[PDB]
Design a protein around this ligand. Sequence first.
Ligand code: HEM
Ligand code: HEM
Ligand SMILES: N=C(N)n1cc2cccc([N+](=O)[O-])c2n1
Ligand SMILES: N=C(N)n1cc2cccc([N+](=O)[O-])c2n1
Ligand SMILES: O=[N+]([O-])c1cccc2cn[nH]c12
Ligand SMILES: O=[N+]([O-])c1cccc2cn[nH]c12
Ligand SMILES: [Zn+2]
Lengths: 414, 416
Amino acid sequence: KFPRVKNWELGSITYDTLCAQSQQDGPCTPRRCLGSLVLPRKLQTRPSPGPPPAEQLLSQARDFINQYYSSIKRSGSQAHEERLQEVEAEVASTGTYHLRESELVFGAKQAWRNAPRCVGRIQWGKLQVFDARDCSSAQEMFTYICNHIKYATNRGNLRSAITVFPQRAPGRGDFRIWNSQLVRYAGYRQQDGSVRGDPANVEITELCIQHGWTPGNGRFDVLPLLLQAPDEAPELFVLPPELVLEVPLEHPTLEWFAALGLRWYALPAVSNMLLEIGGLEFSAAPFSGWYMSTEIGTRNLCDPHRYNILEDVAVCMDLDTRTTSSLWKDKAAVEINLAVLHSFQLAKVTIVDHHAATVSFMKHLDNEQKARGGCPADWAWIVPPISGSLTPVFHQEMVNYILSPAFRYQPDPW
Amino acid sequence: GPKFPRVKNWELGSITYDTLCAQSQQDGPCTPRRCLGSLVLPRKLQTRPSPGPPPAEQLLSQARDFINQYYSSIKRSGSQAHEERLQEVEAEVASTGTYHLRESELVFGAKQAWRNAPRCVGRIQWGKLQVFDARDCSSAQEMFTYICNHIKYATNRGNLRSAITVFPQRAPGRGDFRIWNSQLVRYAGYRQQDGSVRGDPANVEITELCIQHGWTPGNGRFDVLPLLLQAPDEAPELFVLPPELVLEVPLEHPTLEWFAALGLRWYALPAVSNMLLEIGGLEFSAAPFSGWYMSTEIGTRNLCDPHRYNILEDVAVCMDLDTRTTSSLWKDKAAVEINLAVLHSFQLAKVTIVDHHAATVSFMKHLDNEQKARGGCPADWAWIVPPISGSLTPVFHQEMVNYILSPAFRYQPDPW
Ligand code: HEM
Ligand code: HEM
Ligand SMILES: N=C(N)n1cc2cccc([N+](=O)[O-])c2n1
Ligand SMILES: N=C(N)n1cc2cccc([N+](=O)[O-])c2n1
Ligand SMILES: O=[N+]([O-])c1cccc2cn[nH]c12
Ligand SMILES: O=[N+]([O-])c1cccc2cn[nH]c12
Ligand SMILES: [Zn+2]
């Protein structure tokens, strides 16, 4: 029952017993593995059709509370017992309950700690948690987000942070941030069927313009936010330009690289995922840490369905883009990644390369093996999108499973 | 919609449903509670030398399944020849406990097994496999002859041809035919006194077994290992491959003149020789197969893995890169250059080879063919995506479903 996990670079072996704590099913079965799929058909947090079974929720709440008191070493203590009772008293009467600030803080850190696809989990203990459950309007949501952004950015010395809006409630609309990230670039669908800017944001850019936003025509126009308070049409808010730090991309040796006019924002702030803690679901809980260079230089700038800039840089590098065998693509990608690291380091903005990051993940795996006897990880997401085997995590086998607290995907609010 | 896995390609936004997985009859390592898809050796397949023949019934259904696949492949399901062959196989299992395949049936299973391999990116070539039947082989010396003919035909002076040679299946109470080497062509791993390894660290054990069985070792970094072949119930015999038969490619770089001076080289024929080929319940413990190299296997894995030749730092130093800081991406730079060197040297030498870009593209095409031909294609994402430039290839953005289908190639315990 316990998985033997091997690292083929060092011959070392470990056993993952933590996976035994998993109480939530994944998409795989013994007949076929679906671990390569990005999203589930319906593991996904399906919009509360009504109150969840009192037993089920109460069961998840007790485990969390248990987890919490173990954390502070006062397990089995009086507070623990009395806290479990408060929880039971609330579920029985109202059909739900509420977390305490410190419990929320603990829940958030555990959600990050449990995210199988995150390579930066070594930082899991350092998370600024902003309790925004005291929010009743999209306008209030906008003030919170600005504070989170201001704090998170910290003039280029990024600090990981999350902001938690009101949990979901039976029979009422969810609080939602329509944007996938707090900061993204517009995707303008032009006449020729092509797209100016970020192709992945065509739809969202649409919805914005739909709700009265005056669009630009640049390739890097920061999108406005569509904040939605319960059962109210989402509202449009423009992010103050000075709050949104950006890094102009240039190259250490290739003088012309700058002439390309490329740039990216400093703050990677996911805002479309759901945070679940002890059965409670938080539909609006944007979080952020800092970028790993490859996400910008490889995925955002080089994915075919994104800015797809490989050929341009390749032509500017005067490379034989006539045949795959010249490895022109591989050569241009390395420089694009180098430019990002160089530029971010020049703008004195926090960033981590894929080598540094995976080395740190390896250390995290060890700390977690001793701390909990295992660590859920999704190999296809931990290994960088370039130079896979060139990093240590590639040669490290991994067990993937779902632990709670957790960050989950949810339906687009439209 | 459909009660089958929904698969999506995020670059093209297209969707497909894999209904082929429904035909799987072998359980994998994953469960609804945890995914063990990233494990290299899932203790599942690992055809552990079962003491006696499979339960007459376990084998029967497997065989019945294979025969059905064969007759379908020739569009004659339910035909008189089909029910007869079914009666023929059962009758045979009834009187001997096992059975034998017809020539064409073997050819069909061999191709299907390659076709079914979830970890192989070059399956678009599956239908073009030369199957050498060597089930008449009775001695280790004869195994040597076949293997040499395989290498000769397969290498074909640089214009490589995919091939597989099938030795006698496993028989009830009677030693297995085994090739101890993991590949027909591999470099020796010489244990040093300081503790390091000269050559290929991956082969220290096999090297020390050749020596103990009489091999007179060399002391180079690229010494070709002799073959340790094993006939049924006999101790393994050693055989040295005639140098002229082992084509190799010295490596050089198109623009970095000093690269050649590194004295690096690699062999042209990749021939896995330690896998078990299973067809309709029958087990072929010795059945080496070969095709041709995808450049990254040589340039990235063999030459750059830290536990292999680990040549990344040397090349980087020669390139005058800052190996003192990760942010200089010196590993990425050296790897690209080493990989280009492999592609350049093979082409110059006129030896078949394929870069990860062309290969992955052909695989996408292959996925399209199988979607229409079988309703899906079992694929191991972590193995289809190349070890470098992952998201720069089309397969990275293609979700995949992994499952076991037989015929198949399975890992097997080492004979010693
Ligand atoms: C400190 C800096 C951090 C770095 C360098 C980092 C880096 C990454 C990377 C590279 C990915 C995978 C992206 C991909 O392969 O497509 C990822 C995913 C993820 N990270 Fe982190 N992370 C950091 C902080 C955080 C924080 C603060 C949280 C949460 C509080 C977090 C939550 C997650 C989650 C939930 C995922 C998966 C999202 C998805 O499924 O799309 N990360 N992270
Ligand atoms: C046409 C040329 C071929 C190319 C370029 C090719 C390429 C590859 C590559 C890149 C791998 C995975 C390497 C890795 O990630 O470690 C692989 C695995 C595999 N290939 Fe192919 N292949 C070819 C022909 C063949 C043939 C002829 C057979 C069998 C008849 C075959 C059977 C397999 C199997 C069973 C595996 C998995 C081995 C394992 O699990 O370690 N391949 N192939
Ligand atoms: N392409 C491959 N051969 N590999 C795919 C893999 C997936 C997980 C771990 C691996 N390790 O450890 O090597 C691995 N190698
Ligand atoms: N690290 C990642 N973001 N990804 C890991 C993956 C595994 C399979 C398919 C993917 N697609 O299609 O994007 C994928 N992306
Ligand atoms: O690449 N990243 O830095 C990255 C990707 C995805 C999510 C987060 C959160 N902080 N950084 C992240
Ligand atoms: O990389 N390869 O080319 C490769 C790897 C493993 C097996 C075979 C068989 N032909 N080519 C192969
Ligand atoms: Zn799985």
